[PDB]
Recover the amino acids of this structure.
């Protein structure tokens, strides 16, 4: 899975090690191995969420097969909100998530695409 | 709506308050409330646009229902170019926009997805 | 084409001029002019790739017509991995690429969309 987290919290208000802990969290939530989770955190940005510039965060989650239905994205959302509200000390009104299905031909790995791996 | 703005202008050449003013602009252009607009600005990046590294900016706009047609994206583009050229002191050759329709099952909010809200 | 490169290498470990050289590389690989290539590099991020926080990079490539098949994305992947492993001094295990087809109605340019240009 690919997770991208944008936040207006400065880097020194994003707990040390968050990107590693988000791999373990995404593994348990999405049912994929932690060693296939990719996380990118971009702190210190200028952000408004719901029209407001108080601390907030946006997460994007992309994966093959598991982020394409409303019923399973509802479950994934509940778990990622519990992880992020606690780690970032943010209320649930200050986080949004977007889910993006991917296909094997879209993923470049080791100089080829996943269709051939 | 979700707006993401990447620019190679340093933070001190992005006018104070831009992320808030972009919520008001996106509300009027897209016909959605300012308190449902989310803006992320990422300044100080290394960018080439049309092969050139002079100051530039890229905007991505994602929303349900309103960014899926050429005719209405033409109108949205005209208005967002007027806003960004003036705010960022950039010529129209130095900005590009991408539009991305979203569905309700893709948006995680308050620990569920918008399909159930 | 639009290329976005996220990396946990600090800016001073991303060779000067990379964004310009990536325009020339993408032109030859994708068969589009260098003056229609757009590159965004976001260094200094916090990243885990395959569960590990050692130096790494993620590239996203979006274009009309040329990034929609497994067979041609396999070729594009091979060439972009050769360019990035050498430029960033990274092993092939430390880079991933995602490919995203775009349509003309999604691209805002000069205050309109590409459908009308
Ligand atoms: Na993602
Ligand atoms: Na889940
Ligand atoms: Na967007
Ligand atoms: Na409009
Ligand atoms: Na891209
Ligand atoms: Na190629």
């Amino acid at each position: 899975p690919f997770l991208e987290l944008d936040t207006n919290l400065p880097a020194n208000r994003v707990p040390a090690g968050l990107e590693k802990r988000l791999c373990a969290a995404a593994a348990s939530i999405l049912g994929k191995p932690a060693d296939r989770v990719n996380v990118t955190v971009r702190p210190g940005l200028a952000m408004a969420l719901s029209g407001s510039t108080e601390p907030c965060a946006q997460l994007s989650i992309s994966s093959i097969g598991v982020v394409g239905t409303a019923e399973d994205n509802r479950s994934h959302s509940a778990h990622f909100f519990e992880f992020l509200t606690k780690e970032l000390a943010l209320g649930q009104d200050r986080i949004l998530i977007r889910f993006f299905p991917l296909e094997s031909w879209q993923i470049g790995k080791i100089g080829t695409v996943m269709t051939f791996l």
Remarks:
- The helical segments of chain A are 18-30, 70-88.
- Chain A touches chain B through 31 residues (CB under 8 Å).
- The longest strand of chain A covers residues 57-63.
